[PDB]
């Protein structure tokens with residue numbers, strides 16, 4: 001059977017090709033996860049159809065309705081067979097779906113406009129002159145919200161109550177706020193996206209300091225799926241062959257503009 | 259049943275207490291993995307006995323007998339229920355045992371004696387004045403053996419023919435060779451051990467360059483074990499509570515000597 005692959009439009013993982021209107025099927029897409037999907041399918045020996053997740057989300061469970069959204073939702077309600085995307089391995093997601101070993105490692109990091117006198121999450125917590133925030137929804141905001149660590153707790157206390165508001169609705173908006181605030185706004189996001197934007201024009205952004213936590217992106221399958229075991233081994237095979245580092249280098253640095 | 263935990267004497271994961279001769283059972287030992295073992299057992303709700311692996315090895319399929327040695331061997335042949343140690347997640351081990359998601363992320367780094375005019379792997383590859391090698395077996399040597407990357411291919415071509423020999427049989431031997439060779443020997447090893455030794459007296463070593471690859475240590479159980487699922491969730495939970503980072507900070511930097 002043709003395996004249904006759910007994925008998300010996030011650069012440079014899955015992007016629409018220049019002339020995607022002319023093309024059909026899996027040819028419409030390109031990127032890290034498009035290249036990874038091809039390798040995973042070749043190792044496990046299956047045909048696959050790429051599909052973009054309906055609501056354009058990763059996967060979170062609502063506190064009211066209890067309904068899963070995003071790609072996690074698409075796996076648990078049987079709308080897709082496998083999730084090949086930068087989907088963060090988390091406790092609450094691992095309870096409902098299975099993750100492969102991480103194909104990429106990452107952390108929460110600090111994005112600054114070049115020239116900003118900040119280097120550390122400690123620095124940001126000790127001042128206010130430079131504003132800092134996260135995305136208005138999802139993983140990074142939840143990290144600071146639930147953190148019991150002193151310094152991240154002090155940063156959440158500030159961000160809860162900052163005037164003007166410091167949260168942004170999209171990544172693009174967070175990046176634009178950093179670029180246009182003349183070094184007075186710092187943006188907290190996934191280290192992988194931070195280092196990608198650092199390679200985009202007009203090269204005015206910079207990743208600084210060490211990561212605040214340690215996470216991994218994994219490929220997701222449903223509980224008891226017949227693909228889980230082979231997919232897990234494929235990821236390790238591809239890591240030891242050096243293809244995951246070669247794949248990252250291609251989409252982050254070879255196609256880099258800085 | 260009392261869960262049999264296999265582990266290895268490797269600092270600072272498992273170490274003999276100053277007066278272990280007086281103490282019995284699990285009280286003889288201390289370290290990162292000792293503390294982690296207590297946390298995993300508390301979350302999963304089992305009693306446990308810490309046992310040091312008889313042959314003092316991590317685990318590899320013997321060349322002649324094809325029999326697994328070390329901690330991997332103790333899980334595969336039914337001697338142990340769980341391995342709590344810095345056991346590198348690799349394809350060949352994953353084919354015979356089950357791994358939790360990584361509790362620690364790391365890679366290959368460079369150890370130099372302070373003073374050595376080396377800052378990266380590229381610097382190393384451009385010269386033949388200062389010798390450099392790896393452990394005589396395991397993941398670090400394999401990476402260089404397989405690598406298609408020009409710089410690492412050039413480093414392997416040098417290493418595999420170097421005179422005198424640049425490979426060492428133990429970590430203690432590699433570390434000692436750096437300390438006794440007066441800036442003429444650099445040692446390639448796992449980043450975690452590198453940064454541990456940097457905090458050890460007499461404080462004459464330094465970690466330089468970014469990581470050359472990336473891998474992880476996992477908690478391991480036998481295939482189809484009922485303990486695997488809960489242990490995996492435990493590791494993720496402890497990472498999200500910030501405990502794995504506090505344990506890292508405790509044994510590396512809080513107890514540091516430099």
Ligand SMILES: N#Cc1cc2c(cc1[N+](=O)[O-])=NC(=O)C(=O)N=2
Nearest residue numbers: 058086087088138139171190193
């Ligand atoms: N890249 C990336 C990202 C990957 C993400 C993400 C946010 C971002 N991001 O916008 O930076 N949130 C998630 O909950 C997730 O599973 N994976």
Ligand SMILES: N#Cc1cc2c(cc1[N+](=O)[O-])=NC(=O)C(=O)N=2
Nearest residue numbers: 316344345346396429447448451
């Ligand atoms: N720490 C550590 C280490 C952990 C290791 C290791 C070597 C080292 N080392 O001494 O550098 N070899 C392995 O095969 C392994 O599974 N885990």
